[PDB]
Amino acid sequence: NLREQLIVSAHRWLSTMNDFTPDAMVSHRTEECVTRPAPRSLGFAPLNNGQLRTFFKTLTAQMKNFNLALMPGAVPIVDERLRKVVMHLASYAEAACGLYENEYMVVLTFNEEGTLLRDVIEFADSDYCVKFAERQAAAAE
Amino acid sequence: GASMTLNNLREQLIVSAHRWLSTMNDFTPDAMVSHRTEECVTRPAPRSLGFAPLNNGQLRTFFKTLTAQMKNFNLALMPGAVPIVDERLRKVVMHLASYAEAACGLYENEYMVVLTFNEEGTLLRDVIEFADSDYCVKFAERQAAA
């Protein structure tokens, strides 16, 4: 059943982000998979798997105990025709300048079998991203 | 008629999602709260913006303010985005861009919206509006300065 497979693959993706190693975080993707941070005002460019893995190499060295979880009451929204899963998520991590806590709407798109990830839209709380960058800059001096 | 067999809830949900967009672009308070169930709320997100949900009456009052302060409003799918439809849950997800003209200049926001419809797919029963919160905060600043 396609709906069940898409949900399994969406939970697997969540699991690989929580593994929080660069190899695990880019696992189970198609060759041409693209990760697209959003909203556009953040100015973060999309990433292929190699660009993403390189970014995670530094991310996983600067943050610890990353956790991604469904928001309370949130469920996977599944479009079987488009092989898409939408999830409302919360993140937590530990940084040099304290705690990181954010909120996201994520759109996952899978291949036609529903077994490999081929697109991610990661729509973050941009106010929090901006504030966190201010915190990092504050620690820089 | 009744003895013909069927092979279209997805198409119905897409029609109602596009109707929601078109009535938003009509940009009158009445149009902007139309085709909703009696208990429907609009839920601003992320939580950091600090806004509680608005019921139909609260939302109409909000839009009376908004339609008095902005001109040439447009709400539309982001470039290249299409509606994402979960027939089982009666949900439609849309990545949207807004445009309007205010006293302080342009209003240009971006959202991920989750519409939930009633079982028949003909009335909106819930909206989550996940906004670009940095833009929201900056636009509040720009408005205060003016």
PDB file of C-alpha atoms in Angstrom:
ATOM      1  CA  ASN A   1       0.000   0.000   0.000  1.00  0.00           C
ATOM      2  CA  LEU A   2       1.453   3.300  -1.174  1.00  0.00           C
ATOM      3  CA  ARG A   3       0.166   5.426   1.709  1.00  0.00           C
ATOM      4  CA  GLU A   4       1.767   3.135   4.300  1.00  0.00           C
ATOM      5  CA  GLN A   5       5.068   3.058   2.397  1.00  0.00           C
ATOM      6  CA  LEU A   6       5.222   6.857   2.175  1.00  0.00           C
ATOM      7  CA  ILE A   7       4.569   7.132   5.914  1.00  0.00           C
ATOM      8  CA  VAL A   8       7.255   4.513   6.649  1.00  0.00           C
ATOM      9  CA  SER A   9       9.725   6.435   4.474  1.00  0.00           C
ATOM     10  CA  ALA A  10       8.794   9.739   6.114  1.00  0.00           C
ATOM     11  CA  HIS A  11       9.445   8.304   9.572  1.00  0.00           C
ATOM     12  CA  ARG A  12      12.693   6.801   8.274  1.00  0.00           C
ATOM     13  CA  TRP A  13      13.778  10.237   7.045  1.00  0.00           C
ATOM     14  CA  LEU A  14      13.002  11.630  10.491  1.00  0.00           C
ATOM     15  CA  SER A  15      15.099   8.819  11.962  1.00  0.00           C
ATOM     16  CA  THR A  16      18.058   9.584   9.696  1.00  0.00           C
ATOM     17  CA  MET A  17      18.018  13.253  10.683  1.00  0.00           C
ATOM     18  CA  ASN A  18      18.063  12.201  14.328  1.00  0.00           C
ATOM     19  CA  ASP A  19      21.001   9.857  13.638  1.00  0.00           C
ATOM     20  CA  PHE A  20      22.792  13.201  13.129  1.00  0.00           C
ATOM     21  CA  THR A  21      25.805  11.949  11.229  1.00  0.00           C
ATOM     22  CA  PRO A  22      26.526  13.392   7.748  1.00  0.00           C
ATOM     23  CA  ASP A  23      26.316   9.972   6.067  1.00  0.00           C
ATOM     24  CA  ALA A  24      23.072   9.029   7.802  1.00  0.00           C
ATOM     25  CA  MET A  25      21.460  12.412   7.153  1.00  0.00           C
ATOM     26  CA  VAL A  26      21.920  12.029   3.374  1.00  0.00           C
ATOM     27  CA  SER A  27      20.993   8.339   3.270  1.00  0.00           C
ATOM     28  CA  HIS A  28      17.984   6.867   1.454  1.00  0.00           C
ATOM     29  CA  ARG A  29      17.907   9.637  -1.159  1.00  0.00           C
ATOM     30  CA  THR A  30      17.845   9.547  -4.925  1.00  0.00           C
ATOM     31  CA  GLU A  31      20.930  10.656  -6.824  1.00  0.00           C
ATOM     32  CA  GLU A  32      19.329  13.948  -7.872  1.00  0.00           C
ATOM     33  CA  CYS A  33      17.645  14.732  -4.527  1.00  0.00           C
ATOM     34  CA  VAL A  34      17.426  18.433  -3.609  1.00  0.00           C
ATOM     35  CA  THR A  35      16.980  19.994  -0.173  1.00  0.00           C
ATOM     36  CA  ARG A  36      15.356  23.447  -0.314  1.00  0.00           C
ATOM     37  CA  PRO A  37      15.483  25.637   2.804  1.00  0.00           C
ATOM     38  CA  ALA A  38      12.657  28.151   3.067  1.00  0.00           C
ATOM     39  CA  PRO A  39      11.327  30.835   3.330  1.00  0.00           C
ATOM     40  CA  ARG A  40      13.150  32.613   0.543  1.00  0.00           C
ATOM     41  CA  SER A  41      13.983  35.597   2.784  1.00  0.00           C
ATOM     42  CA  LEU A  42      16.540  33.450   4.653  1.00  0.00           C
ATOM     43  CA  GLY A  43      18.647  33.420   1.482  1.00  0.00           C
ATOM     44  CA  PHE A  44      19.771  29.782   1.805  1.00  0.00           C
ATOM     45  CA  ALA A  45      20.419  28.077  -1.534  1.00  0.00           C
ATOM     46  CA  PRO A  46      19.152  24.564  -2.342  1.00  0.00           C
ATOM     47  CA  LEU A  47      21.557  21.667  -1.823  1.00  0.00           C
ATOM     48  CA  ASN A  48      22.237  18.478  -3.697  1.00  0.00           C
ATOM     49  CA  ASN A  49      23.310  15.462  -1.617  1.00  0.00           C
ATOM     50  CA  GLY A  50      27.000  16.391  -1.734  1.00  0.00           C
ATOM     51  CA  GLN A  51      26.415  20.043  -0.902  1.00  0.00           C
ATOM     52  CA  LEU A  52      24.113  18.905   1.896  1.00  0.00           C
ATOM     53  CA  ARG A  53      26.576  16.338   3.257  1.00  0.00           C
ATOM     54  CA  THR A  54      29.334  18.969   3.322  1.00  0.00           C
ATOM     55  CA  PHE A  55      27.068  21.341   5.217  1.00  0.00           C
ATOM     56  CA  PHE A  56      26.161  18.624   7.727  1.00  0.00           C
ATOM     57  CA  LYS A  57      29.846  17.840   8.333  1.00  0.00           C
ATOM     58  CA  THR A  58      30.211  21.253   9.942  1.00  0.00           C
ATOM     59  CA  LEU A  59      26.688  21.318  11.420  1.00  0.00           C
ATOM     60  CA  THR A  60      27.196  18.027  13.277  1.00  0.00           C
ATOM     61  CA  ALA A  61      30.502  19.364  14.651  1.00  0.00           C
ATOM     62  CA  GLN A  62      28.947  22.578  15.998  1.00  0.00           C
ATOM     63  CA  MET A  63      25.623  21.191  17.323  1.00  0.00           C
ATOM     64  CA  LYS A  64      24.938  18.252  19.616  1.00  0.00           C
ATOM     65  CA  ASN A  65      21.956  16.099  20.594  1.00  0.00           C
ATOM     66  CA  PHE A  66      19.852  17.245  17.660  1.00  0.00           C
ATOM     67  CA  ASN A  67      16.275  15.990  17.794  1.00  0.00           C
ATOM     68  CA  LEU A  68      13.461  16.346  15.270  1.00  0.00           C
ATOM     69  CA  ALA A  69       9.914  15.377  16.198  1.00  0.00           C
ATOM     70  CA  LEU A  70       6.321  15.837  15.084  1.00  0.00           C
ATOM     71  CA  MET A  71       4.566  18.748  16.779  1.00  0.00           C
ATOM     72  CA  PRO A  72       1.856  17.786  19.301  1.00  0.00           C
ATOM     73  CA  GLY A  73      -1.159  16.507  17.401  1.00  0.00           C
ATOM     74  CA  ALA A  74       0.646  16.686  14.055  1.00  0.00           C
ATOM     75  CA  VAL A  75       0.284  13.769  11.634  1.00  0.00           C
ATOM     76  CA  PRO A  76       1.842  12.899   8.264  1.00  0.00           C
ATOM     77  CA  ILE A  77      -0.231  14.445   5.477  1.00  0.00           C
ATOM     78  CA  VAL A  78       0.125  12.100   2.491  1.00  0.00           C
ATOM     79  CA  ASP A  79      -0.471  12.809  -1.199  1.00  0.00           C
ATOM     80  CA  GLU A  80      -0.166   9.350  -2.769  1.00  0.00           C
ATOM     81  CA  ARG A  81      -0.430  10.662  -6.328  1.00  0.00           C
ATOM     82  CA  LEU A  82       2.471  13.103  -5.917  1.00  0.00           C
ATOM     83  CA  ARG A  83       4.378  10.842  -3.462  1.00  0.00           C
ATOM     84  CA  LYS A  84       4.555  13.741  -1.004  1.00  0.00           C
ATOM     85  CA  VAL A  85       4.428  13.809   2.808  1.00  0.00           C
ATOM     86  CA  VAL A  86       3.965  17.037   4.794  1.00  0.00           C
ATOM     87  CA  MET A  87       4.897  17.198   8.469  1.00  0.00           C
ATOM     88  CA  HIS A  88       4.789  19.908  11.136  1.00  0.00           C
ATOM     89  CA  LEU A  89       7.940  19.473  13.227  1.00  0.00           C
ATOM     90  CA  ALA A  90       9.898  20.846  16.166  1.00  0.00           C
ATOM     91  CA  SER A  91      13.678  20.769  16.475  1.00  0.00           C
ATOM     92  CA  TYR A  92      15.988  20.899  19.457  1.00  0.00           C
ATOM     93  CA  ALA A  93      19.756  21.016  19.658  1.00  0.00           C
ATOM     94  CA  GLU A  94      22.617  22.172  21.863  1.00  0.00           C
ATOM     95  CA  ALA A  95      24.997  24.829  20.525  1.00  0.00           C
ATOM     96  CA  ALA A  96      27.965  26.756  21.864  1.00  0.00           C
ATOM     97  CA  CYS A  97      25.651  29.677  22.699  1.00  0.00           C
ATOM     98  CA  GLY A  98      23.042  27.535  24.470  1.00  0.00           C
ATOM     99  CA  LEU A  99      19.878  25.859  23.213  1.00  0.00           C
ATOM    100  CA  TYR A 100      18.416  25.784  19.705  1.00  0.00           C
ATOM    101  CA  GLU A 101      14.653  25.280  19.368  1.00  0.00           C
ATOM    102  CA  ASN A 102      12.828  25.779  16.083  1.00  0.00           C
ATOM    103  CA  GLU A 103       9.590  24.887  14.294  1.00  0.00           C
ATOM    104  CA  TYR A 104       9.105  23.740  10.693  1.00  0.00           C
ATOM    105  CA  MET A 105       6.670  22.793   7.999  1.00  0.00           C
ATOM    106  CA  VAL A 106       8.423  20.159   5.875  1.00  0.00           C
ATOM    107  CA  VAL A 107       7.424  18.814   2.446  1.00  0.00           C
ATOM    108  CA  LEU A 108       9.040  15.484   1.518  1.00  0.00           C
ATOM    109  CA  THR A 109       8.767  14.177  -2.042  1.00  0.00           C
ATOM    110  CA  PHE A 110       9.668  10.558  -2.790  1.00  0.00           C
ATOM    111  CA  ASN A 111      10.351   8.539  -5.905  1.00  0.00           C
ATOM    112  CA  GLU A 112       7.431   6.723  -7.490  1.00  0.00           C
ATOM    113  CA  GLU A 113       7.927   3.601  -5.345  1.00  0.00           C
ATOM    114  CA  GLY A 114       7.855   5.781  -2.228  1.00  0.00           C
ATOM    115  CA  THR A 115      11.170   4.365  -0.998  1.00  0.00           C
ATOM    116  CA  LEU A 116      13.767   7.104  -1.681  1.00  0.00           C
ATOM    117  CA  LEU A 117      13.633  10.829  -0.961  1.00  0.00           C
ATOM    118  CA  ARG A 118      14.021  13.131  -3.972  1.00  0.00           C
ATOM    119  CA  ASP A 119      13.011  16.573  -2.667  1.00  0.00           C
ATOM    120  CA  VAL A 120      12.762  18.335   0.707  1.00  0.00           C
ATOM    121  CA  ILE A 121      11.271  21.738   1.416  1.00  0.00           C
ATOM    122  CA  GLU A 122      12.335  22.724   4.937  1.00  0.00           C
ATOM    123  CA  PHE A 123      10.222  25.778   5.858  1.00  0.00           C
ATOM    124  CA  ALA A 124      11.681  27.077   9.139  1.00  0.00           C
ATOM    125  CA  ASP A 125      10.602  29.733  11.623  1.00  0.00           C
ATOM    126  CA  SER A 126      12.746  32.429  10.026  1.00  0.00           C
ATOM    127  CA  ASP A 127      12.545  34.877  12.952  1.00  0.00           C
ATOM    128  CA  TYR A 128      14.247  32.213  15.059  1.00  0.00           C
ATOM    129  CA  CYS A 129      16.927  31.544  12.437  1.00  0.00           C
ATOM    130  CA  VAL A 130      17.717  35.260  12.339  1.00  0.00           C
ATOM    131  CA  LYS A 131      17.842  35.491  16.138  1.00  0.00           C
ATOM    132  CA  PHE A 132      20.106  32.441  16.351  1.00  0.00           C
ATOM    133  CA  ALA A 133      22.531  34.002  13.866  1.00  0.00           C
ATOM    134  CA  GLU A 134      22.578  37.088  16.102  1.00  0.00           C
ATOM    135  CA  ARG A 135      23.422  34.801  19.030  1.00  0.00           C
ATOM    136  CA  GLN A 136      26.251  33.141  17.093  1.00  0.00           C
ATOM    137  CA  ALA A 137      27.643  36.539  16.088  1.00  0.00           C
ATOM    138  CA  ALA A 138      27.430  37.651  19.725  1.00  0.00           C
ATOM    139  CA  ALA A 139      29.605  34.691  20.737  1.00  0.00           C
ATOM    140  CA  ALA A 140      32.066  35.536  17.938  1.00  0.00           C
ATOM    141  CA  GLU A 141      33.368  38.562  19.876  1.00  0.00           C
TER     142      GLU A 141
ATOM    143  CA  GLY B   1     -28.436   7.843 -14.039  1.00  0.00           C
ATOM    144  CA  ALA B   2     -28.201   6.079 -10.665  1.00  0.00           C
ATOM    145  CA  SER B   3     -27.248   2.703 -12.233  1.00  0.00           C
ATOM    146  CA  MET B   4     -24.052   3.955 -13.923  1.00  0.00           C
ATOM    147  CA  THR B   5     -20.896   2.932 -12.072  1.00  0.00           C
ATOM    148  CA  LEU B   6     -18.074   5.250 -11.025  1.00  0.00           C
ATOM    149  CA  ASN B   7     -14.476   4.588 -12.110  1.00  0.00           C
ATOM    150  CA  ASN B   8     -13.146  12.342  -7.665  1.00  0.00           C
ATOM    151  CA  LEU B   9     -12.522  13.646  -4.145  1.00  0.00           C
ATOM    152  CA  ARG B  10      -9.016  14.843  -5.054  1.00  0.00           C
ATOM    153  CA  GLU B  11     -10.395  17.101  -7.773  1.00  0.00           C
ATOM    154  CA  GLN B  12     -13.091  18.419  -5.421  1.00  0.00           C
ATOM    155  CA  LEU B  13     -10.450  19.325  -2.823  1.00  0.00           C
ATOM    156  CA  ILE B  14      -8.349  21.087  -5.466  1.00  0.00           C
ATOM    157  CA  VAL B  15     -11.418  23.040  -6.633  1.00  0.00           C
ATOM    158  CA  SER B  16     -12.174  24.114  -3.059  1.00  0.00           C
ATOM    159  CA  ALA B  17      -8.539  25.060  -2.421  1.00  0.00           C
ATOM    160  CA  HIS B  18      -8.516  27.198  -5.556  1.00  0.00           C
ATOM    161  CA  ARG B  19     -11.835  28.707  -4.494  1.00  0.00           C
ATOM    162  CA  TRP B  20     -10.224  29.647  -1.183  1.00  0.00           C
ATOM    163  CA  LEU B  21      -7.416  31.398  -3.071  1.00  0.00           C
ATOM    164  CA  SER B  22      -9.810  33.209  -5.405  1.00  0.00           C
ATOM    165  CA  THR B  23     -12.013  34.505  -2.591  1.00  0.00           C
ATOM    166  CA  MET B  24      -8.908  35.678  -0.749  1.00  0.00           C
ATOM    167  CA  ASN B  25      -7.966  37.660  -3.857  1.00  0.00           C
ATOM    168  CA  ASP B  26     -11.478  39.133  -3.927  1.00  0.00           C
ATOM    169  CA  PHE B  27     -10.134  40.919  -0.829  1.00  0.00           C
ATOM    170  CA  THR B  28     -13.349  41.793   0.925  1.00  0.00           C
ATOM    171  CA  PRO B  29     -13.903  40.671   4.526  1.00  0.00           C
ATOM    172  CA  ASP B  30     -16.987  38.749   3.440  1.00  0.00           C
ATOM    173  CA  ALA B  31     -15.165  36.901   0.666  1.00  0.00           C
ATOM    174  CA  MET B  32     -12.148  36.187   2.869  1.00  0.00           C
ATOM    175  CA  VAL B  33     -14.241  34.269   5.430  1.00  0.00           C
ATOM    176  CA  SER B  34     -16.578  32.589   2.934  1.00  0.00           C
ATOM    177  CA  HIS B  35     -17.177  28.833   2.519  1.00  0.00           C
ATOM    178  CA  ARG B  36     -16.092  27.948   6.055  1.00  0.00           C
ATOM    179  CA  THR B  37     -17.772  25.722   8.618  1.00  0.00           C
ATOM    180  CA  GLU B  38     -19.247  27.433  11.670  1.00  0.00           C
ATOM    181  CA  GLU B  39     -16.419  26.235  13.952  1.00  0.00           C
ATOM    182  CA  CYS B  40     -13.580  26.937  11.492  1.00  0.00           C
ATOM    183  CA  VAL B  41     -10.500  28.680  12.882  1.00  0.00           C
ATOM    184  CA  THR B  42      -7.434  30.147  11.208  1.00  0.00           C
ATOM    185  CA  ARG B  43      -4.323  29.219  13.201  1.00  0.00           C
ATOM    186  CA  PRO B  44      -1.271  31.462  12.732  1.00  0.00           C
ATOM    187  CA  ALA B  45       2.074  29.685  12.946  1.00  0.00           C
ATOM    188  CA  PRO B  46       4.887  29.310  13.979  1.00  0.00           C
ATOM    189  CA  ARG B  47       4.164  29.474  17.710  1.00  0.00           C
ATOM    190  CA  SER B  48       6.883  32.104  18.182  1.00  0.00           C
ATOM    191  CA  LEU B  49       4.638  34.746  16.581  1.00  0.00           C
ATOM    192  CA  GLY B  50       2.447  34.372  19.677  1.00  0.00           C
ATOM    193  CA  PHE B  51      -0.970  34.506  17.974  1.00  0.00           C
ATOM    194  CA  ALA B  52      -3.911  32.362  19.041  1.00  0.00           C
ATOM    195  CA  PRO B  53      -6.376  31.043  16.434  1.00  0.00           C
ATOM    196  CA  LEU B  54      -9.115  33.294  15.082  1.00  0.00           C
ATOM    197  CA  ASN B  55     -12.690  32.098  14.685  1.00  0.00           C
ATOM    198  CA  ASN B  56     -14.866  33.281  11.792  1.00  0.00           C
ATOM    199  CA  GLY B  57     -16.021  36.426  13.590  1.00  0.00           C
ATOM    200  CA  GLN B  58     -12.525  37.367  14.767  1.00  0.00           C
ATOM    201  CA  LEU B  59     -11.114  36.757  11.291  1.00  0.00           C
ATOM    202  CA  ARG B  60     -13.764  38.929   9.636  1.00  0.00           C
ATOM    203  CA  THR B  61     -12.910  41.758  12.049  1.00  0.00           C
ATOM    204  CA  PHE B  62      -9.195  41.327  11.315  1.00  0.00           C
ATOM    205  CA  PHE B  63      -9.817  41.479   7.571  1.00  0.00           C
ATOM    206  CA  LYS B  64     -11.837  44.698   7.916  1.00  0.00           C
ATOM    207  CA  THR B  65      -8.607  46.228   9.222  1.00  0.00           C
ATOM    208  CA  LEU B  66      -6.370  44.580   6.619  1.00  0.00           C
ATOM    209  CA  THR B  67      -8.560  45.494   3.638  1.00  0.00           C
ATOM    210  CA  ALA B  68      -8.594  49.113   4.855  1.00  0.00           C
ATOM    211  CA  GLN B  69      -4.784  49.340   5.073  1.00  0.00           C
ATOM    212  CA  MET B  70      -3.619  47.489   1.947  1.00  0.00           C
ATOM    213  CA  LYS B  71      -4.258  47.701  -1.787  1.00  0.00           C
ATOM    214  CA  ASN B  72      -3.661  45.444  -4.795  1.00  0.00           C
ATOM    215  CA  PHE B  73      -3.559  42.298  -2.670  1.00  0.00           C
ATOM    216  CA  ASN B  74      -2.576  39.064  -4.368  1.00  0.00           C
ATOM    217  CA  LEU B  75      -2.227  35.566  -2.917  1.00  0.00           C
ATOM    218  CA  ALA B  76      -0.943  32.831  -5.195  1.00  0.00           C
ATOM    219  CA  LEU B  77       0.956  29.585  -5.387  1.00  0.00           C
ATOM    220  CA  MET B  78       4.722  30.140  -5.210  1.00  0.00           C
ATOM    221  CA  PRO B  79       6.527  29.892  -8.567  1.00  0.00           C
ATOM    222  CA  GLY B  80       6.388  26.220  -9.515  1.00  0.00           C
ATOM    223  CA  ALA B  81       4.327  25.102  -6.494  1.00  0.00           C
ATOM    224  CA  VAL B  82       1.136  23.043  -6.788  1.00  0.00           C
ATOM    225  CA  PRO B  83      -1.466  21.942  -4.238  1.00  0.00           C
ATOM    226  CA  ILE B  84      -0.591  18.822  -2.244  1.00  0.00           C
ATOM    227  CA  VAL B  85      -3.750  16.815  -1.548  1.00  0.00           C
ATOM    228  CA  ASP B  86      -4.416  14.169   1.136  1.00  0.00           C
ATOM    229  CA  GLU B  87      -7.844  12.829   0.125  1.00  0.00           C
ATOM    230  CA  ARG B  88      -8.146  10.652   3.227  1.00  0.00           C
ATOM    231  CA  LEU B  89      -7.604  13.563   5.635  1.00  0.00           C
ATOM    232  CA  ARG B  90      -9.418  16.133   3.421  1.00  0.00           C
ATOM    233  CA  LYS B  91      -6.296  18.300   3.574  1.00  0.00           C
ATOM    234  CA  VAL B  92      -4.645  20.524   0.958  1.00  0.00           C
ATOM    235  CA  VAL B  93      -1.168  22.008   1.514  1.00  0.00           C
ATOM    236  CA  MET B  94      -0.026  25.042  -0.494  1.00  0.00           C
ATOM    237  CA  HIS B  95       3.218  26.994  -0.638  1.00  0.00           C
ATOM    238  CA  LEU B  96       2.039  30.574  -1.206  1.00  0.00           C
ATOM    239  CA  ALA B  97       3.322  34.077  -1.869  1.00  0.00           C
ATOM    240  CA  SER B  98       1.408  37.197  -0.865  1.00  0.00           C
ATOM    241  CA  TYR B  99       1.743  40.684  -2.316  1.00  0.00           C
ATOM    242  CA  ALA B 100       0.114  43.931  -1.264  1.00  0.00           C
ATOM    243  CA  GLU B 101       0.732  47.673  -1.159  1.00  0.00           C
ATOM    244  CA  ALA B 102       0.691  49.418   2.212  1.00  0.00           C
ATOM    245  CA  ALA B 103       1.554  52.887   3.503  1.00  0.00           C
ATOM    246  CA  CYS B 104       5.043  51.697   4.496  1.00  0.00           C
ATOM    247  CA  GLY B 105       5.572  50.213   1.014  1.00  0.00           C
ATOM    248  CA  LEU B 106       5.335  46.674  -0.318  1.00  0.00           C
ATOM    249  CA  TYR B 107       4.112  43.690   1.686  1.00  0.00           C
ATOM    250  CA  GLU B 108       5.666  40.511   0.241  1.00  0.00           C
ATOM    251  CA  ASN B 109       5.265  37.453   2.466  1.00  0.00           C
ATOM    252  CA  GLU B 110       5.552  33.691   2.029  1.00  0.00           C
ATOM    253  CA  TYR B 111       3.546  30.929   3.694  1.00  0.00           C
ATOM    254  CA  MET B 112       2.988  27.220   3.982  1.00  0.00           C
ATOM    255  CA  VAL B 113      -0.775  26.769   4.445  1.00  0.00           C
ATOM    256  CA  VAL B 114      -2.635  23.605   5.490  1.00  0.00           C
ATOM    257  CA  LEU B 115      -6.346  23.676   4.615  1.00  0.00           C
ATOM    258  CA  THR B 116      -8.619  21.028   6.125  1.00  0.00           C
ATOM    259  CA  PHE B 117     -12.083  20.608   4.623  1.00  0.00           C
ATOM    260  CA  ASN B 118     -15.221  18.914   5.878  1.00  0.00           C
ATOM    261  CA  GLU B 119     -15.931  15.324   4.832  1.00  0.00           C
ATOM    262  CA  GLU B 120     -17.628  16.396   1.606  1.00  0.00           C
ATOM    263  CA  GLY B 121     -14.663  18.617   0.715  1.00  0.00           C
ATOM    264  CA  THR B 122     -16.964  21.622   0.223  1.00  0.00           C
ATOM    265  CA  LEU B 123     -16.367  23.772   3.321  1.00  0.00           C
ATOM    266  CA  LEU B 124     -13.121  24.796   4.994  1.00  0.00           C
ATOM    267  CA  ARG B 125     -12.990  23.600   8.616  1.00  0.00           C
ATOM    268  CA  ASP B 126      -9.412  24.508   9.604  1.00  0.00           C
ATOM    269  CA  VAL B 127      -6.496  26.583   8.297  1.00  0.00           C
ATOM    270  CA  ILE B 128      -2.920  26.585   9.544  1.00  0.00           C
ATOM    271  CA  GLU B 129      -1.047  29.583   8.138  1.00  0.00           C
ATOM    272  CA  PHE B 130       2.700  29.080   8.669  1.00  0.00           C
ATOM    273  CA  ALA B 131       4.230  32.468   7.797  1.00  0.00           C
ATOM    274  CA  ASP B 132       7.729  33.806   7.176  1.00  0.00           C
ATOM    275  CA  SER B 133       8.010  35.017  10.761  1.00  0.00           C
ATOM    276  CA  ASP B 134      11.086  37.193  10.213  1.00  0.00           C
ATOM    277  CA  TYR B 135       9.168  39.028   7.511  1.00  0.00           C
ATOM    278  CA  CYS B 136       6.166  39.321   9.849  1.00  0.00           C
ATOM    279  CA  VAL B 137       8.277  40.922  12.583  1.00  0.00           C
ATOM    280  CA  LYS B 138      10.125  43.208  10.180  1.00  0.00           C
ATOM    281  CA  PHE B 139       6.860  44.327   8.586  1.00  0.00           C
ATOM    282  CA  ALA B 140       5.455  45.179  12.021  1.00  0.00           C
ATOM    283  CA  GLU B 141       8.562  47.317  12.603  1.00  0.00           C
ATOM    284  CA  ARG B 142       8.203  49.029   9.208  1.00  0.00           C
ATOM    285  CA  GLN B 143       4.569  49.783   9.978  1.00  0.00           C
ATOM    286  CA  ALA B 144       5.301  51.179  13.436  1.00  0.00           C
ATOM    287  CA  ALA B 145       7.934  53.515  11.976  1.00  0.00           C
ATOM    288  CA  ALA B 146       5.317  54.913   9.575  1.00  0.00           C
TER     289      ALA B 146
END
